[PDB]
């Protein structure tokens, strides 16, 4: 295909131009809701922890794809391994509320607690980057999914439910120095 490149209009040429035949494609695995819908680790934890998806690892499957969007929306599931009872409070609650039973509190049941939580931010969508300040770099404090507290929080997994992503941003593979290809050990049978 020949065109005006400067206009930046999408152009998708096919193998038919030189006699080939375009095949059928099945893209379920790159569907946004599907791909974000799996548990990933949060990692930097404390007994009092504010749920912030930006604490996912930046190169992890979910963390990288999330950072490759400017705005997003989703509900959430969490799996928490903790000592003591686990309390959760919604976005906007005073940190002091984490000490009370009247807020959703899960009594310990081995091996860990799994819960479904709704989006509770006061904004219509959240952002992974925010160009400005929120007080009268970092993200506004209101970008969170609430907070949890237990005597000890050993592990925390989060899962984005019914995710929506808006305005794509750069997503990078590892840099290559080999001058030809990034090579690594791909799994193969023994002996």
């Amino acid at each position: 295909t020949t065109t005006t490149g400067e206009s930046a209009d999408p152009v998708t040429t096919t193998v038919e131009n030189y006699g080939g035949e375009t095949q059928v494609q099945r893209r379920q695995h790159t569907d946004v809701t599907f791909i974000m819908d799996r548990f990933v680790k949060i990692q930097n934890l404390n007994p009092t922890h504010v749920i912030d998806l930006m604490q996912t690892h930046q190169h992890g499957l979910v963390g990288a794809l999330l950072r490759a969007a400017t705005y997003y929306f989703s509900d959430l599931e969490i799996v928490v391994r903790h000592d003591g009872n686990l309390t959760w409070v919604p976005n906007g609650a005073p940190e002091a509320a984490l000490s009370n039973t009247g807020n959703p509190t899960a009594y310990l049941k081995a091996p860990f607690t799994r819960l479904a939580l709704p989006y509770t931010a006061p904004h219509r969508v959240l952002a992974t980057v925010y160009n400005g300040t929120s007080k009268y770099a970092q993200l506004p404090a209101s970008f969170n999914f609430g907070a949890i507290q237990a005597t000890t929080i050993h592990e925390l997994l989060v899962r984005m439910k019914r995710a929506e992503l808006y305005c794509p941003r750069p997503l990078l593979a590892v840099e290559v120095s080999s001058q030809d290809r990034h090579k690594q050990k791909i799994i193969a049978p023994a002996k």
Partner: protein
Amino acid sequence: DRILTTRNGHTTSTTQSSVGVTYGYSTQEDHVSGPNTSGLETRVVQAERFFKKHLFDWTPDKAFGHLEKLELPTDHKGVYGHLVDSFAYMRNGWDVEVSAVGNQFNGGCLLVAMVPEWKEFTPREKYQLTLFPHQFISPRTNMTAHIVVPYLGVNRYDQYKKHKPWTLVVMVVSPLTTNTVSAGQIKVYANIAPTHVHVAGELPSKE
């Protein structure tokens, strides 16, 4: 048809070397009357007109990746600027024209893009700025890029003194080349108009 005339209020811009208009993310605005302004917002058409800004001088020594940016809104000394000081909340989209006038004997290429929620891009990320609404300016073909974007953001109305949702970005893709018959440098300017300007929450006078 390479000749385009754009009108915003009582201001017009005519270009004979355009490659069309790129619409980013949408061809219309989200609803301007939501629950957060309780029906108290109003439109100010007197602000919907072109204002100007010099962005930079494209010279042969600027290499691939050289990036110049302009966060919006910028300092405005006209009607739009007074609105920012008189109302607590505002929203508007942007009608952006960027021109780079040299002559057809210059070579090279500039990427012109509109980026939501600007953050400093690393060198590797610069290879992917075409993910954002954009056009290219290449002397052999055009002197003007034109992009139209709607208002967006986590909030339906904004406080521009605290947050700037859009940033105009110009990046050198291939360096400016010169001949004996070409221009020696190209000054890059922006002709920008705010669109669908709405304000809410009138402020007290400062005196």
